[PDB]
């Protein structure tokens, strides 16, 4: 059934599972036409498929060409997401295929279920968690690879960099969702926090700076503060 704060630790057991987030699959700018009507222009998107235990990210880049001459694009995006997740599963060796896929938006269940009919022993699950995975395009290197793409492309990342050498998946995942939640509520400040210090760099094979343990603690506190402030502002509490 649905994932929530109760069955939260299940994410970190040894059953292979993937999160699928479709929020950035169909991305548009909106503009005015010469005649003064509104039109959309599509930009490149991505399916965010993440193993929360290992950090392996399967970043399936969605090139604007896939929308060419298509109608009901937001509906189609869900079906193209499920097509691509299904093809990813089929591409994995059997012992690597997930036992569960957790979709971050309920509207993906039926498309994914229908695309996964060949995989009846893979459970498709919704979630009640409000996961910040839409903010994945606030990670500079993921945005860069999506926006430069000239064709459909799968790019593989570890979204935890080398954190698992030092911390558990559980702690890694909470760090990731904390960072992403801050980038989602106030990207400008969140990104300032991460880079204020020119001496902490991002390795070429990483997404995030090479913070020491002590620096991560100060960071994580700086992100919580940011999240809490933005909340009082949003609601006037």
């Amino acid at each position: 059934g649905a994932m929530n704060s109760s069955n939260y630790a299940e994410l970190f057991n040894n059953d292979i599972k993937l999160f699928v987030d479709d929020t950035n699959v169909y991305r548009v700018t909106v503009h005015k036409t010469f005649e003064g009507n509104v039109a959309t222009k599509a930009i490149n998107g991505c399916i965010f498929t993440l193993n929360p235990k290992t950090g392996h990210l399967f970043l399936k880049i969605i090139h604007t060409s896939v929308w060419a001459g298509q109608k009901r694009l937001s509906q189609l995006a869900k079906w193209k997401t499920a097509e691509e997740v299904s093809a990813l599963v089929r591409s994995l060796p059997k012992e690597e295929q997930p036992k569960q896929i957790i979709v971050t938006r309920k509207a993906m269940l039926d498309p994914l279920e229908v695309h996964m009919l060949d995989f009846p022993n893979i459970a498709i699950r919704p979630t009640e968690l409000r996961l910040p995975f839409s903010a994945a395009m606030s990670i500079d290197k993921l945005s860069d690879v999506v926006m430069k793409a000239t064709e459909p492309q799968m790019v593989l990342f570890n979204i935890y960099d080398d954190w698992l050498d030092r911390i558990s998946s559980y702690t890694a995942f909470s760090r990731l969702t904390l960072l992403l939640r801050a980038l989602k509520t106030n990207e400008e400040s969140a990104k300032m926090i991460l880079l204020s210090d020119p001496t902490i760099t991002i390795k070429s094979y990483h997404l995030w700076p090479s913070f020491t343990d002590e620096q991560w603690i100060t960071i994580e506190s700086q992100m919580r503060d940011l999240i809490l402030t933005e909340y009082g502002r949003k609601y006037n509490v």
Binding site: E83, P111, E113, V114, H115, L117, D118
Partner: protein, 300 residues
């Protein structure tokens, strides 16, 4: 004009024949139902005065034999049986008419209701959904489950309706996932009409039989099947025009005949609001839409 005599009425029971029914008191001298119209299937059904649970009954066709009811006090129910002795049966029936112990099937001549509810229902198809081939008639009750219900336990006592499932390989061609799931025409016309039912009339007959089992026995799995067969048509962008117009007639008489008080469990809110307002065929069920609106606007 055919007859179904009863050996006796030992227990207080409400007897139904088709859409009619009568109260019969314990050891009241009731000995059958006469003037049953030939040419249609029929169902005779029962609800004991003591056990408002378990409605049950028998689907039959008088052309297929001479049938009577007898109470079995060991099994505790009214049983349909066949008399093979053709003479011995006209004797029982004539003597009971002579003593005038039989009710007349009470058809208004202007009234086509039963024909309209049973247009496509054939006894041969009923006997394949209720497999019990030693008998020419078919028993159904409140609690019988369907083959689909079971996959998710006793098979001798199941309703073998055609399994319909919108999220299944049968329903969905590989490569047409999205298309076939949003537009079920493939599944309706090739898989179900041409493949399984062979023609539209066997499909309507199963649809109509499922409705009547839901209506007369409150059989919850029949209701599921009735709604699924509706939804499949309404969710198909491409339906023969003759099927659409007939469907509208079929549903109209079903909705007309439903007891007003039961429109809460027999009518599935989502299926109907989808079929009448969202589906491809939203505009193809004018008569069914008009009666739903005027009689159950709450559900919508």
């Amino acid at each position: 004009m055919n007859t179904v005599p009863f050996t006796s009425a030992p227990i207080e029971v409400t007897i139904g024949i088709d859409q009619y029914s009568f109260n019969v008191k314990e050891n009241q001298p009731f000995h059958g139902i006469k003037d049953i119209p030939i040419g249609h299937v029929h169902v005779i059904h029962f609800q004991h005065a003591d056990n408002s649970s378990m409605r049950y009954g028998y689907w039959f066709d008088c052309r297929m034999g001479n049938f009577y009811i007898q109470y079995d006090p060991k099994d505790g129910l009214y049983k349909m049986m066949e008399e093979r002795d053709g003479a011995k049966f006209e004797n029982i029936v004539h003597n009971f008419k002579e003593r005038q112990m039989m009710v007349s099937y009470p058809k208004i001549d202007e009234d086509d209701t039963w024909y309209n509810l049973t247009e496509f229902v054939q006894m041969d198809k009923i006997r394949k959904i209720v497999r019990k081939d030693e008998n020419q008639f078919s028993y159904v009750d409140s609690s019988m489950t369907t083959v689909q219900e079971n996959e998710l336990s006793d098979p001798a006592h199941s309703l073998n309706y055609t399994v319909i499932n919108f999220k299944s390989r049968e329903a969905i061609r590989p490569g047409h996932e999205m298309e076939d799931f949003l537009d079920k025409s493939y599944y309706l016309n090739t898989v179900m009409l041409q493949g399984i039912f062979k023609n539209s009339s066997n499909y309507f007959g199963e649809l109509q039989f499922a409705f009547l089992n839901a209506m007369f026995f409150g059989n919850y799995g029949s209701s599921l099947q009735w709604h699924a067969m509706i939804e499949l048509i309404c969710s198909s962008a491409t339906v023969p025009k003759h099927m659409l117009d007939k469907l509208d007639e079929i549903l109209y008489y079903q909705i007309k005949t439903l007891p007003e008080q039961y429109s809460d469990i027999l009518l599935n809110e989502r299926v109907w609001n989808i079929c009448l307002y969202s589906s491809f065929q939203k505009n193809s069920l004018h008569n069914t839409e008009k009666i739903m609106e005027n009689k159950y606007p709450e559900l919508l």
